[PDB]
Amino acid sequence: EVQLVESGGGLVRPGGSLRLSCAASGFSYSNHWMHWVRQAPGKGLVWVSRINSDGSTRNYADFVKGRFTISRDNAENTLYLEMNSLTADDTAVYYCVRDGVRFYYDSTGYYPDSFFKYGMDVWGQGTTVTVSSASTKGPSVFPLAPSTAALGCLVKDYFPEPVTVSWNSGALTSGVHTFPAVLQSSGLYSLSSVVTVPSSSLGTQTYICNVNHKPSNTKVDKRVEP
Amino acid sequence: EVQLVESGGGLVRPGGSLRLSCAASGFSYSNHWMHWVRQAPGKGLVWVSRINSDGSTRNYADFVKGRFTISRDNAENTLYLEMNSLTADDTAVYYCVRDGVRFYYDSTGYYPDSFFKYGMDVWGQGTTVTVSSASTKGPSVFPLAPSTAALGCLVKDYFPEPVTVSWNSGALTSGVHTFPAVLQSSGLYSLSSVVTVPSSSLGTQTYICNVNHKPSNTKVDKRVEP
Amino acid sequence: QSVLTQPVSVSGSPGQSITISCTGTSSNADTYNLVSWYQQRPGKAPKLMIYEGTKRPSGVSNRFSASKSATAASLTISGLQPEDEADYYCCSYATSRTLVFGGGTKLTVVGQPKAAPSVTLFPPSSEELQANKATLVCLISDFYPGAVTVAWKADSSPVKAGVETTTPSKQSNNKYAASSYLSLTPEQWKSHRSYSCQVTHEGSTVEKTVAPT
Amino acid sequence: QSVLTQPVSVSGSPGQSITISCTGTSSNADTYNLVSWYQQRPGKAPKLMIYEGTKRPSGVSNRFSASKSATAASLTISGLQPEDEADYYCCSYATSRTLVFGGGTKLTVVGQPKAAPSVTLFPPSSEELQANKATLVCLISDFYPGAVTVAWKADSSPVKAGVETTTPSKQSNNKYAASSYLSLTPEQWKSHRSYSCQVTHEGSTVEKTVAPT
Amino acid sequence: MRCIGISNRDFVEGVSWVDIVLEHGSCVTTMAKNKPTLDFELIKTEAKQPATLRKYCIEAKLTNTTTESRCPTQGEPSLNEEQDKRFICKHSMVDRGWGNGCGCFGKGGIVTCAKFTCKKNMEGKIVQPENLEYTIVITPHSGEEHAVGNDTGKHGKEIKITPQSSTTEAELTGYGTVTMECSPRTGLDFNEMVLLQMEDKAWLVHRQWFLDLPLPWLPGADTQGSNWIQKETLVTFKNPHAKKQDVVVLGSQEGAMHTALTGATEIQMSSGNLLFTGHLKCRLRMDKLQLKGMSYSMCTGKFKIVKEICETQHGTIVIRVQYEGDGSPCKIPFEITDLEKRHVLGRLITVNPIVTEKDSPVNIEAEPPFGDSYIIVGVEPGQLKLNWFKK
Amino acid sequence: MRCIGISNRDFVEGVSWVDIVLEHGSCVTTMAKNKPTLDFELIKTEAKQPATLRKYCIEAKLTNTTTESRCPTQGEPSLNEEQDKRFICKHSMVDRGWGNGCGCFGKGGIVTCAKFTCKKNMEGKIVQPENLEYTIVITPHSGEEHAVGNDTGKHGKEIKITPQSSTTEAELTGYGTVTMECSPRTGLDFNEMVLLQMEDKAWLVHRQWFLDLPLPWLPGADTGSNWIQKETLVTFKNPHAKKQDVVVLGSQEGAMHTALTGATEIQMSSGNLLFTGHLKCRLRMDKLQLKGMSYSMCTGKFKIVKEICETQHGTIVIRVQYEGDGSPCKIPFEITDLEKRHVLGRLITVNPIVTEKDSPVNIEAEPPFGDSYIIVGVEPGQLKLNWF
Ligand SMILES: *[C@@H]1O[C@H](CO[C@@H]2O[C@@H](C)[C@@H](O)[C@@H](O)[C@@H]2O)[C@@H](O[C@@H]2O[C@H](CO)[C@@H](O[C@@H]3O[C@H](CO[C@H]4O[C@H](CO)[C@@H](O)[C@H](O)[C@@H]4O)[C@@H](O)[C@H](O[C@H]4O[C@H](CO)[C@@H](O)[C@H](O)[C@@H]4O)[C@@H]3O)[C@H](O)[C@H]2NC(C)=O)[C@H](O)[C@H]1NC(C)=O
Ligand SMILES: *[C@@H]1O[C@H](CO[C@@H]2O[C@@H](C)[C@@H](O)[C@@H](O)[C@@H]2O)[C@@H](O[C@@H]2O[C@H](CO)[C@@H](O[C@@H]3O[C@H](CO[C@H]4O[C@H](CO)[C@@H](O)[C@H](O)[C@@H]4O)[C@@H](O)[C@H](O[C@H]4O[C@H](CO)[C@@H](O)[C@H](O)[C@@H]4O)[C@@H]3O)[C@H](O)[C@H]2NC(C)=O)[C@H](O)[C@H]1NC(C)=O
Ligand SMILES: *[C@@H]1O[C@H](CO)[C@@H](O)[C@H](O)[C@H]1NC(C)=O
Fold this sequence. Notes:
The complex is a heterohexamer, with two copies of chain A (226 residues), two copies of chain C (213 residues) and two copies of chain E.
Chain A: E1 3-7, E2 11-12, E3 18-25, E4 33-39, E5 45-51, E6 58-60, E7 68-73, E8 78-83, E9 92-99, H1 102-105, E10 120-123, E11 127-131, E12 140-144, E13 149-158, E14 164-167, E15 176-178, E16 182-183, E17 189-197, E18 207-213, E19 218-224
Parallel strand pairs in A: 2-11
Antiparallel strand pairs in A: 1-3, 3-8, 4-5, 4-9, 5-6, 7-8, 9-10, 9-11, 12-13, 13-17, 14-18, 15-17, 16-17, 18-19
Chain C: E1 3-5, E2 9-12, E3 18-25, H1 29-33, E4 36-40, E5 47-50, E6 64-68, E7 72-77, E8 86-93, E9 99-101, E10 105-109, E11 118-122, H2 126-130, E12 134-143, E13 149-154, E14 157-159, E15 163-165, E16 169-170, E17 176-184, H3 186-191, E18 195-201, E19 204-210
Chain E: E1 9-13, E2 17-22, E3 27-32, E4 35-47, E5 51-69, E6 87-96, E7 106-126, E8 132-140, E9 157-161, E10 167-172, E11 176-185, E12 193-197, E13 201-206, H1 207-211, E14 217-219, E15 235-238, E16 246-249, H2 254-260, E17 265-269, E18 274-275, E19 279-285, E20 303-311, E21 317-323, E22 330-331, E23 334-337, E24 347-348, E25 354-355, E26 362-367, E27 373-377, E28 384-388
Parallel strand pairs in E: 1-3
Antiparallel strand pairs in E: 2-19, 3-4, 4-8, 5-7, 5-14, 6-7, 7-12, 8-9, 10-11, 11-19, 12-13, 13-17, 15-16, 17-18, 20-21, 21-26, 22-25, 23-27, 24-26, 27-28
Bound molecules: a molecule of 6 linked components (NAG-NAG-BMA-MAN-MAN-FUC) (2 copies) and 2-acetamido-2-deoxy-beta-D-glucopyranose.
PDB class: immune system/viral protein
Keywords: immune system-viral protein complex, viral protein, membrane fusion, class 2 fusion protein, dengue virus, broadly neutralizing antibody, FAB fragment
Assembly: hexameric
């Protein structure tokens, strides 16, 4: 019907630059306003920028003090976002978005009237931008000793995703919850895995967590005792 | 006397730019030819560029297809080297150098006569330029099992320098040799540490290498067995 | 200037009608006249639900309606369905040239009874301390709906530096779990009498405290 | 154009007179008339030793003299002392406007008896292979003088891709050690019958070989 | 309906055939008895076969500066660059001696070469009048709900014409064909004129004048060429005291050219398309045009006023109304009479307003009379009665 | 000895005071009976207290373009950039209507703003005549081995003068003092002229003409970002009432050069000038003295370290080294006919003396036309050289 496909997302070093590029199809691209919106992982939508038909009006959010430049190529049905001086605050998925409603009022898509009626009715799938500074690392695993009881393993400072965790070589599955990883300010990931077991078993049953990080081809088996 | 002090060397990303700046004092700078010379770590001297008194004549080596521009400011007694499109082949120490002998023949230092008598008699201490592509990284340590006998530990892919290695928490010092690191094409360093021990001890005495990489706050204790 | 705020979470039962508010600071009637609403299901791209404060685009279910005043904008979903469980965002103009989104509202469709979180706080492991590092691990489990807020404290002083918290995720039993991390140096950990993890769920707060000693 | 080549190494005894040659390709009498010589001690900046083919600047010891011919230029050191154990470079014009250095000559002053290197070749560790990597480690120790050359071979085929070798460094016993690395993929390592490390010292060669199987 | 809202709009009525004049930023509305009202606009003008005559450098850059000198009696110096056509070289003499690196005292030859690189240029293009393609957009007054001033043109038939292929039949979906026999009336005749194209500006200048410009040029034959002729015109060699030779650029001639091009016919430009000052005089035959649905009945139901009446810059009014009755497709009854409903007064612009779908409203444009008027749309009962004022 | 090798060299001789004329690229060699021969050269001219009158932009750039429009009857649009003095803004009217995002049909106000950035400028400097500092280098003919044509001047006493402080005594180490009473002889007077400085070029132009240039400028006080008269290089185009465009009028560098043809050009170098005006000085040598006139003649033999060369003015320069003993001592020098009957050439480097045996001496002399004999030292081993 109507679609938008973004490209150019990936790993970038702090202070680095990247160019995002969106391909539009199924509508009169040259007559529509276009926007860039972003979303940090697991967080909310954040409006980034917009450009009119001509390109004579290009607006940016306050957090982009001048570091990103939006642009477009009407005949190529393409939208661009040039990004410089990237920091950890900018890691996010970036979505290419069409303002289809404004087309209904100003079919030229040129005039930058104040507070004009708008609507972001078409969205791309988004491209992931990760601004970090590491490449491969096996994790450091630390025990979270019991204090029913909950015990676990903390898997600190690995990159990239993913890490898998089992317990007792897969023998312990009831009550196991392996948590989504967090990305830290260091650019490394950490996650935790927990199992809730009867407190009465704490003296008798051995509990060992088996952490596998395939990208670094690292495996660690950590025993967790009170 | 007379000395030359270079500045501006440091870490630069591939494709990046850097400006080297050399301060000259104590001799009639404006009348001397000046050169830039470089030296890759552990390798030989490579002539880079020269500039005359006026700056009307600026010559460059074949490997700098136009990427570096030499310049000077006589009243500020300063020499510059503007570098663009840097690659791993350019990692090196850069030396600021005076041609003092030509001064004895052409006191103006202007005329670019073909094959004129020259002599690089004054050298700076050099500024280190490292064109690389990691930010911080702890090493991966692998055992080099014995096959007297020599055994060791290989410390792969860390950045920056330095790494320290001890054996048996500092108890094994006789016969220990920790080798200078190599810089690889990846931009990461590796080194090895070896100890020569009596072959009769290989079955009995445990040997453990303790690798410390302070820049990444990493410590690894690797057991080395036959 | 203008900043749009929404409720962190809203919990409704099937068949019920829920309303999500979008309020603004330094805003006026034009802000709300131009408010648009977007639905984002987990792992999916946003979808336009409302524009021009109250107009519903074609294709959007007639169960979605919207209202606006000079002080707030609201989205109403009548006949709540399990497929409506999602994050909802409001959007309007921040200035004559720039747009801004609200913080988002996680709308929960209640299939199961509300469950308060269980909280476990782990101190740094001796092993990690030997590595000249310290991480406090705050485990939140078995809560529903899947919206919590987390506050950390050093003694009685709220702490935000170094805190990283995951988005709640469904457990094997369909309730939610989330994790929060406070990263410290051993000297930092040891410099205070205690640390606390505060979990707020459905207006109630559970705080667990651990001490270096 | 013009390219200047020097011997890789020259070994002399105290009191002796050694000569280092600098020969050129696409060169002529003017190239050598303009040859300059530079001394670089380990970790120190270069020092001008000779200019204009044969002129010695003031301050440079009178034990250093130079000669030039129509096909080469030479530096001669009379009465070798332990204090002159540097790398020596020749320099001249590559074109009418541009200069070029020689590859350098490492001059060793024999202070202690010559010692042939001991060579240990380690294969990739099982741990590294599990990391989808492979590194051959060639350990060179207890040699004097402190000049060696290293060649790697895959089966019988000389290999230069992926080879990285350290500059020899003094051991605790005043003899020298150096290390050489061959970086491979596990598939590369496993694709050949054997690998070899060849160490050349004072005109003799020691080659160690290891095999994947 | 595309013309609605543009100030430079013309209302041409044919006494079957009609001569109209199209230019950029001007729309023409044509009307004829029992013929559909049509909107014409010149959307784009293009020169498709322009022969580059000469390319001039207006801003240049000297790089890769190289110098060679020789001691007295050692001959003339030489650089290979002197045989490279991208380099500008000059030989001179300097004072040489002991204090200047020569064993003897005299005039040593010097030679300085630099790479001439153009940063900004001007192109002169010769364009044949018959190769000027025009793109006209014909939008019928179909009343469609969005047809009003819609630039997209999903409503008007685009057609391209040239001064030779002056006659074209254009089919309008539901109205038949319209014959157009056009003719160019440019300000100046393209014979002996050169379209001096620089950046986003353009001009028409005398051929001999163009060729006589003292600037470096590249012939039309060598385009993308590097052997700039007359480099001397922007490069100067200075050796005033016979001590050193310096090569200096003469500085961008862009503004100088603009000043020289004051008394010239300026043309607007856009990456090989032109917004041209001239006009296109066409003749249009509507004998094959037909009112769509001339055999339809009157709408019986009542009409609702979806959008407030607005006045255009030329006094006409546009009313968008929606049909609530039954019967569609049906003819909309429309009339503008006095306050006493005695006689029809204003004129209809959107002749024969018809309904296509009840949901889709219709846009009717009419010329109301001066003063108080009555806009009657529909029929009793619920016949819409709106009073309008016209100062 | 610095003058040796420069073609524009003058040989001025004065009976027992002597008037000389110094200009750039001209050296003057002065000689006087029983007085040392001196070499004078104007090495640099500098305008030191120039008050910038006005700075003009000759090449500008427009960036950060921003536009706002309003619908008819919705008032005048406004942007904050209109209050930023680095921005050039303009209000216009466009045709608005249903097809253009307005509920009714009419003229909607538009406003376009762009950031004016100068890429190339011109500075006008006012220079006071008395503040034009000249740097003259006086190099005595001391014969030192490398003194000959050495631009460094590490042997020549530098002296700075101004049209007012015309009279200066300069002490020459080993020769005493020389009094210089100079005067300016410029081409134009600095009164009502402005030194239009651009890049490496410079000119002298009429003040009123300078002020009448239609270009953006910055006053001497703001040397700043609030360029005045930005309109002179910026143009707003809205021909069809549909859209407003902002366009730069293009670099005026070459236009200025063309305008500056009938003006006195001056060469420039980062605030120094290579002025075409001649400095007329008067030089008094009553306090000058030949160093070492009481020393005795050298007894040993001399060696010829460097091949005799002829200068552009027929004079010859001979570098000789003393091998004998006695230093410091006077070199015996003569240039006679082939038969040694009568001395013919003149000495330029009067009283050539040796200071150290190792350091050779440079003697410059005017040989006579034809065959001559250059006799340096005294028998035995007295050097006998033949000249053409
Ligand atoms: C200039 O002309 C534009 C196109 O001109 C066409 O010409 C006529 C002859 C027809 O071919 C017609 O297709 C065009 O008008 C014109 O653009 C068109 O504008 C309409 C909006 O009026 C576009 O959207 C359509 O409307 C609904 C909105 O529904 C709400 O509003 C209506 C009333 O307008 C109510 O009845 C409803 O209850 C709602 O409250 C859109 O949602 C929908 O578009 C999307 O629909 C689904 C959603 O999943 C997708 O599959 C589609 O791809 C769309 O994403 C309707 O289509 C219409 O799409 C658009 N046409 C084109 C081709 O873009 C423009 O408005 C005119 N402007 C001016 C100033 O004159
Ligand atoms: C133009 O004038 C230049 C400076 O003029 C000086 O001014 C007066 C006031 C005095 O200071 C006097 O020294 C000068 O007249 C002049 O530059 C000078 O040139 C000499 C070279 O002739 C420089 O170098 C010195 O010579 C030795 C070379 O020794 C070899 O050759 C000599 C014979 O020439 C033999 O006797 C020896 O056995 C050698 O075979 C240099 O090596 C040395 O400079 C360096 O010495 C050590 C090295 O570690 C360092 O500590 C120093 O700092 C130097 O790096 C001697 O100094 C002399 O340095 C230089 N002076 C200055 C101030 O630069 C120039 O030659 C004249 N040229 C022309 C064309 O007129
Ligand atoms: C707009 O101004 C900012 C602030 O100086 C600058 O960083 C940015 O580059 C400017 N925009 C463009 C397109 O240059």
